[PDB]
Amino acid sequence: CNKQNGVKNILITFTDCDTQEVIGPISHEQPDDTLPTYKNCAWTNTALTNGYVQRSASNATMTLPVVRDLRVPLAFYQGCAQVDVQVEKFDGTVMTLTEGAVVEPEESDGRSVTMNIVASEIDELLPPGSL
Amino acid sequence: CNKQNGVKNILITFTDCDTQEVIGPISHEQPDDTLPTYKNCAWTNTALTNGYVQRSASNATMTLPVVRDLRVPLAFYQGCAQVDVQVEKFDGTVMTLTEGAVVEPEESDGRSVTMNIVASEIDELLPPGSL
Amino acid sequence: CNKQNGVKNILITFTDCDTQEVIGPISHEQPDDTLPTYKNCAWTNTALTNGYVQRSASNATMTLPVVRDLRVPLAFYQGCAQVDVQVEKFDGTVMTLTEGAVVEPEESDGRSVTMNIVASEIDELLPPGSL
Amino acid sequence: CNKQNGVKNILITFTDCDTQEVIGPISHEQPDDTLPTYKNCAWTNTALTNGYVQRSASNATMTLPVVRDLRVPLAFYQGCAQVDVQVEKFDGTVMTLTEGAVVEPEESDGRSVTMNIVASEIDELLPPGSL
Amino acid sequence: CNKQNGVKNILITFTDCDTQEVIGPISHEQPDDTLPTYKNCAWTNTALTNGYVQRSASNATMTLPVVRDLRVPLAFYQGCAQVDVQVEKFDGTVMTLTEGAVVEPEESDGRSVTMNIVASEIDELLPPGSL
């Protein structure tokens, strides 16, 4: 196939904060057709004048809409646990992220969560053959 | 009958402030298909730099769209009374909250209310089998 | 019946400012299906930290969309006269409000007015039997 | 033929500023079904505390969506001329306004104008029979 | 006819900045049904109190959505050249504007441009017969 824009696998590994118990990597599934979105470059530019740029520092960002697992507390998806995320799309790309931190929690009805995770850097796998 | 996302039971227990009388736990019903939303973590992360996180302090919060009971004064749903809430979904999860405080009241036509409740912590029951 | 969410009666009593002539209580009718909305609790909460609340002071608020009577000047519905309002819904609830003050006027074409009335306290009647 | 909400007659009388020539009262027509809006009170209340009101000073205002006449320069509808307006609805009410001032002009394609007029007071005629 | 609200002719004359070469007046055409919009009055009012007005100074403004000519550089439509515009509607009105200045450029895909032009004064022609 290798011609389908879509997410295939989502692995999340939870680390409890006050017991350091590792949980996972549990698979996960999407609540709707919206895909997780990424941003890898740490430095972010900003226009200055005739052609130049002013460079700022930032984090490697990820937005992950996921369906809560009924075996894991809801608070683990809202900033009360460390997360390691790994998303594999249908065309072969694999984005891994470790020592994340859910940065902006928001009210969730109990099924669908939207995690905003910031890390030092995101790794990309790029299907075989690449420049 | 699992694999149904939806709220099954809502118990709300009112406590007047000027007389310390307890009312309930009365059952309740939703005005529409929107489900209550939760947040159990206490501290909210915030992105800082390349990989690090700045940790702030916050609340356990709950958002409860409910249908006003006709035997209970409307003001009880609008911050003039302490609330103790208990929501049970169809997958078995039970979220209980005690010593609530309706934190941002709003205009209601007299039938449907949306209670924003804040508390120290919300407890999760996590259907049998858990990690 | 007693199973129909809707407004049945709207009585408004106008008091001229510079002559203290009482007018009413004239009945009134809705321009569309939107109902008047209420808020009784005087103190309004605000979240502080782990579980606590900071309490502010406010007014008993009412929002009343109504159809202007052709016998009463338009300025009476826009803050140039004192109002006493009384709304009775179909399920038996009756909200009375006296010594109101139309607080935020807005342009109206001449038929439909939306009065935002603030008072010290709103009284609620709660169909027979109540806790 | 009463019980029709709609505007029947619009007379606008222009007065140039640099020559003090009076033009009109020309009739006019609406560009669409939106009706002009009014506000006759002078002071605008504002909620203060449990029941009280803080009274501010303001204008008698009118909002007039009208179709530009081709014999009158466009600038006359955009603040470069004094206006005296008279609107008669189908229920018999007549709102007259004199010594207007188009207070916030806006881009117009050349046919439809929306005049925001401010004046000391707007007079209401209140179809026969009144209280 | 003389009963059709629409634009008939759009003439634009470009003046290069660093060579003062005059180009035009080239005709032009609309990208969609939105018409150019105008504002002639230089002084703009602002409401003050019971009936009075505070008068500010401004420019004669024009908004011109047009289709880029393939013979003229795109930068000429984005503030890098002086413009003289002349728009003639179907009912006979003619708005001429000279020594304009495209004041707020914005990204354009290469076909449709929206020029925001400010000048000292706009002239209006008013089909024969006028008051």
């Binding site: - | 406590t15 402030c17 000027d18 009374a81 302490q82 010593e99 609530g100 405080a101 | 103190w43 909460n45 606590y52 609340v53 309490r55 002071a57 | 002071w43 504002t46 203060l48 505390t49 009280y52 009101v53 803080q54 009274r55 501010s56 000073a57 | 109190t49």
Partner: protein, 131 residues
């Protein structure tokens, strides 16, 4: 807390007999001493010299149809000769002397309310002579 009754926990403020409603309550406690910084030395000294004189700052509001008379009476009381007894809303009874009282009172911006910013100082009695 969730059932914190404010006006059943804050004392109603009053100075020298005259009662009023306060909007804020501050204090300026402290402990004054010297600070020794011996030259060329990695050591520092401190000497406790006494008690820093206490000062209170309040903000009174007047929102009533006769706020002008109330503010005039309060001015006449505050200018009485000699220190008098003050009921600080959160510190109870003290003996203070008024030191400044700004009276903000606008008309075309907020008519109806009058604010007074008060500044008192702990004024303890003495015993004439050389004590």
């Amino acid at each position: 807390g969730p059932c914190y009754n404010p006006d059943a926990e804050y004392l109603p403020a009053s100075f020298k007999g005259f009662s009023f409603d306060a909007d804020s309550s501050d204090s300026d406690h402290g402990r004054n001493g010297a600070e020794a910084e011996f030259v060329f030395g990695e050591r520092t000294g401190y000497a406790d010299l006494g008690i820093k004189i206490k000062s209170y700052q309040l903000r009174a509001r007047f929102q009533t149809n006769d706020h002008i008379a109330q503010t005039n009476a309060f001015i006449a009381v505050l200018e009485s000769p000699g220190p008098g007894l003050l009921v600080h809303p959160t510190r109870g009874t003290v003996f203070a002397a008024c030191r400044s009282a700004r009276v903000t009172d606008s008309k075309v911006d907020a008519a109806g309310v009058t604010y007074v910013e008060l500044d008192f100082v702990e004024a303890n009695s003495v015993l004439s002579g050389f004590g």
